[PDB]
Amino acid sequence: KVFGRCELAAAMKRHGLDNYRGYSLGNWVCAAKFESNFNTQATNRNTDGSTDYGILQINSRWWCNDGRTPGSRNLCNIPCSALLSSDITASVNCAKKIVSDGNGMNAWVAWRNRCKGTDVQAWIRGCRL
Template structure:
């Protein structure tokens, strides 16, 4: 009995540690478009830039981590860099986040940081956007491709909630 308990204890500990797995998600283009517009209120006039950026930075994959030549890493859907906007292993950087927090399926913190980066540095912060999305002709027409309505159903023409 004692031998069984000695063997079973490490197995149980490993199982419990395994329960806290990081979930990741690979989005489809239109799925992410609708999530960003409907859940996170992204401006529809810039949504094609954001989707193009994410497609060329992370291939729409929330768990992507890229090792950079300067020994830093880019994390998550928006490939946020560990040199300035987050810190590996602990909260820090300009977004005050652990970099690893950007590599799971909770994209709320990624979005908050990406919006701050875009406000400060513009889309040019992202090399994938610079290479592939800067020319407006290269942007996907998400209104057609993803059936993106010009107005959300709960908003009036001015953008205020009706009712």
């Protein structure tokens, strides 16, 4: 599923991401924009053999199991395929664990390079929330 911007903001807010760990909703929408272009089916292979999955590009090195990342962890205790469903509950719940482990949203390379320090509020402007 390719979400619309305001559609994704509404689903993230419904699942309790707005201001989760102090990150306003515009940060989460922005990160999803640049990690996946709002596409729940996005995947990207990393140079170390791991893979990033879903609308927030969560990495199999630590957070999910895909059966093909030797020596990796599954800290969110989910198959990585659960991060590709049109329902973002799995992605949101895993994002809550990731963003809580001490480094905040810097865990998302696209957020750090393209959202951090910008006017992230623009990404939820105009949305009825």
